[PDB]
Amino acid sequence: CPFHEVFNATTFASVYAWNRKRISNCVADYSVIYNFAPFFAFKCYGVSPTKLNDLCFTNVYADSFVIRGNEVSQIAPGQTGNIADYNYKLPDDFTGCVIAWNSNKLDSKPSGNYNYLYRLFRKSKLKPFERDISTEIYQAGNKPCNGVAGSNCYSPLQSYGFRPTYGVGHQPYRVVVLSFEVC
Amino acid sequence: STIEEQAKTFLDKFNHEAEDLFYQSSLASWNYNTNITEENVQNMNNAGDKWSAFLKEQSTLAQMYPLQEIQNLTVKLQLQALQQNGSSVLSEDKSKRLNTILNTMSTIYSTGKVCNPDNPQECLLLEPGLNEIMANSLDYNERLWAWESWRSEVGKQLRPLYEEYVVLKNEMARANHYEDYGDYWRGDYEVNGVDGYDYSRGQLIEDVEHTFEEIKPLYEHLHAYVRAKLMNAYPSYISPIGCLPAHLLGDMWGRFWTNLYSLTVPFGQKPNIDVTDAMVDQAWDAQRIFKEAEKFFVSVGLPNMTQGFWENSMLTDPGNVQKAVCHPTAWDLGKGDFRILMCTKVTMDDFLTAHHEMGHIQYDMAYAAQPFLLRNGANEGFHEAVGEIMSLSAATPKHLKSIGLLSPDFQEDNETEINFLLKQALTIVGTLPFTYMLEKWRWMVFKGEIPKDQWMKKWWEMKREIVGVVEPVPHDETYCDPASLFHVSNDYSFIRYYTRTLYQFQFQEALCQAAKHEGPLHKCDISNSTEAGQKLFNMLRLGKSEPWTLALENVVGAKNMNVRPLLNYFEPLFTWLKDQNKNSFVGWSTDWSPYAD
Ligand SMILES: *[C@@H]1O[C@H](CO)[C@@H](O[C@@H]2O[C@H](CO)[C@@H](O)[C@H](O)[C@H]2NC(C)=O)[C@H](O)[C@H]1NC(C)=O
Ligand SMILES: *[C@@H]1O[C@H](CO)[C@@H](O[C@@H]2O[C@H](CO)[C@@H](O)[C@H](O)[C@H]2NC(C)=O)[C@H](O)[C@H]1NC(C)=O
Ligand SMILES: *[C@@H]1O[C@H](CO)[C@@H](O[C@@H]2O[C@H](CO)[C@@H](O)[C@H](O)[C@H]2NC(C)=O)[C@H](O)[C@H]1NC(C)=O
Ligand SMILES: *[C@@H]1O[C@H](CO)[C@@H](O[C@@H]2O[C@H](CO)[C@@H](O)[C@H](O)[C@H]2NC(C)=O)[C@H](O)[C@H]1NC(C)=O
Ligand SMILES: *[C@@H]1O[C@H](CO)[C@@H](O[C@@H]2O[C@H](CO)[C@@H](O)[C@H](O)[C@H]2NC(C)=O)[C@H](O)[C@H]1NC(C)=O
Ligand SMILES: *[C@@H]1O[C@H](CO)[C@@H](O[C@@H]2O[C@H](CO)[C@@H](O)[C@H](O)[C@H]2NC(C)=O)[C@H](O)[C@H]1NC(C)=O
Ligand SMILES: *[C@@H]1O[C@H](CO)[C@@H](O)[C@H](O)[C@H]1NC(C)=O
């Protein structure tokens, strides 16, 4: 299985446009991630974490993105917040495994790192498993803005200010969510 | 589609754009405060002015949501704290003039000089050399010369500026519907729209004048004692039924009396506890102290440190060339970053300042979940009280005989009890009359009750009436004595130093009632008792979200400030004092004067 090609890319994508890599029908060896790193967060929800090697299904998907620190607790079935409503929502019969680990010394530079966005203004809450790449001015008032920044018409894409001198809870964490539905 | 929904949509684009633009300014200021170089000054001023301009633009933008239709309370609090025009409501010329006179006042206060009448080439500033003579000397004429020359040659320069700063500030406050500047200052203790916790600005005054009346029966006895003792260091200068001359008090103005302790110590044959040799002869470094403080704080139930505080904080003084102004502070750079700055040594006073700073840090850590505009104390007086009760409790013999500094037995007698209580009273209850009086005078000036041809007369009348000191040389209406103070010249509020001193003690008598204390109040500790930490953290995590007269109820059980805990804390010294003045005359008459001859 080609897992080391998704756990190791030089850069992940931001949350508002996550990266989805679908796995084909081959042999899967999970013994490399299970003994990979500290793994600040690793929770399986459907499958047996102690028996993973004994089951297999048709298709598995690997989504990947980079979120803030204290927001990993929102990548879970049935959560609410600025991340699991406008950017990435998990259904209520989820079956994969959520894994997330710290990446403070690789994605954060002094004087700011403004290349990891996250959309926080959407007219309607996201339906399960849908992404959006729109960059239209979210209009809050009653006056047409025709597409300029101003008053009651805000731009929806805003960037993280990742820096190394942060406390745990704002350092950039990397998340790789697996979904199951190969052996 | 409402005039309320466009409030939340706007506060979210401001609670994320400010928490990021504030970090730049704060970090750039830290970079200068611990490494004083030339380029760092401009690197800090740039980000500072950037953040200021951003706040100004957001303020002039947020005037589109009328506060009269907002229904939620938290968004109302945020919009009201962001909406206030503040200054700059005047014209341009007026604002320029005000800024110039404020800078001139600060400069004149900082760099004044007064020399000798027999050698005019050896004059001293205020800070390094004048308030040292006023604090360590013992000769009458020298103290008198200092106190008179500091007001005759630096005071006379502030009157024609104060008589204009008053009018400018009055106009700036009347252009915001406040009726004077004193109302603007009291506008911090204002609470509107809670239905059970209302607090109008006009009541604050009353409250003060209804609690200071309960302190006098103790301040009078303390005053009579200090006088009956001072009359043995400068004989034939103090009369037994008069006031104290305002230059023998201990410093330039008489704010604290703590420099008098060498003259008026009750039992001068018992050295009060000072673990400064046990700390040194046991190889205690500048880092073990903070470990002990963190252990004490984790004992009661508050969280550990953040692991970003041990790597970046500057606990030790950088020696060879890193010249850094180190007045001990605790920073809140934001985004989960908390640091401490203090050039610590291994003594006792720093062992308590460590606990004070860690108290500030625990407070700033608890409420880091609220929005940006609500990260502050419940009012302007909670912060120092929370930071002070910790150091108040971390210096009791029961504590220092369990940490290890003191002997395990250390026989204790009531004499050291009296010693410590008096050394505390000469600083806690010795500064309440002065603070109350100065604030009353400033209010009565700003409101307009004292015409500008009666300033010095009313000031000295009130000093003789309340504090109990008398001027040693007649002061006419050309001088200006109140302006010779730091908090009066640089335009700082002063009422907080009178509320903190109350709040603090209340908190103690609350938490010690949870830890189930037994003895008197001043022998109490809140360590090893988790209920105390829980009761305190129930209030720590609020910030300015709720009105302050509610967060005070969660820990005490009342609604307003009180004064029973202070007298309950000082009861032993009181009972001892009332049996020391059988022959003297408790009280003072306002007729005697050191020049009435
Ligand atoms: C992810 O990439 C890093 C480097 O890009 C890999 O680190 C290598 O690990 C092997 C085995 O320990 C070493 O021999 C190499 O020297 C390492 N490379 C470098 C540049 O230090 C890492 O193994 C990759 N992860 C996976 C799962 O393949
Ligand atoms: C304190 O500030 C000075 C002035 O900026 C620093 O001195 C230079 O700092 C730059 C910025 O990193 C370095 O590139 C230079 O090499 C420094 N010069 C010298 C002679 O050291 C100084 O580094 C700062 N203090 C610390 C501890 O970094
Ligand atoms: C408007 O007011 C309501 C309550 O008056 C706030 O609701 C609280 O919201 C926080 C965080 O969203 C929750 O933790 C609380 O449990 C809520 N309270 C209740 C009683 O449910 C609401 O947050 C306010 N609006 C905004 C924008 O903060
Ligand atoms: C804050 O200051 C402004 C002036 O800078 C006050 O006056 C309003 O300013 C806006 C902006 O130009 C005008 O559109 C309004 O017509 C002005 N008058 C009003 C709103 O009555 C504003 O009133 C001040 N607000 C507060 C709360 O002090
Ligand atoms: C707080 O509680 C702790 C634990 O109960 C106390 O620490 C112990 O105190 C006893 C008292 O003699 C010592 O024998 C133990 O050696 C201590 N434990 C350790 C690990 O040293 C502590 O003394 C209590 N502090 C106060 C002020 O009551
Ligand atoms: C300290 O405590 C002792 C008793 O422990 C006090 O001594 C008594 O004081 C009264 C005062 O009139 C005498 O009548 C008793 O005879 C004293 N006892 C003895 C054994 O002489 C002492 O007064 C206390 N001192 C202070 C300052 O509190
Ligand atoms: C605090 O830190 C100390 C030292 O690492 C540790 O022993 C203790 O368990 C920690 N407590 C908490 C609540 O984190």
Numbering used by the authors:
A (entry chain E): 336 to 516, 524 to 525
B (entry chain A): 19 to 615
What is written in the article reporting this PDB entry?
The Omicron sub-lineages harbor multiple mutations in the S protein compared to the original strain (referred to as the WT strain), which mediates receptor recognition and facilitates membrane fusion with the host cells. Despite the extensive mutations, all these Omicron subvariants still utilize ACE2 as the host receptor. Hence, we characterized the ACE2-bound S protein structures derived from BF.7, BA.2.75, and XBB.1 subvariants.
To further analyze the RBD-PD interface in detail, we also determined the structures of monomeric RBDs (BA.2.75, BF.7, and XBB.1) bound to the ACE2-SIT1 complex. These structures provided improved resolution of the RBD-PD interface, avoiding the flexibility of RBD, and were resolved at local resolutions of 2.9, 3.2, and 3.6 Å, respectively. Besides, XBB.1 displays mutations D339H, V445P, G446S, F486S, F490V, and R493Q when compared to BA.2. Of particular note is the single difference among BA.2.75, BF.7, and XBB.1: the substitution of Phe486 in BA.2.75 with Val in BF.7 and Ser in XBB.
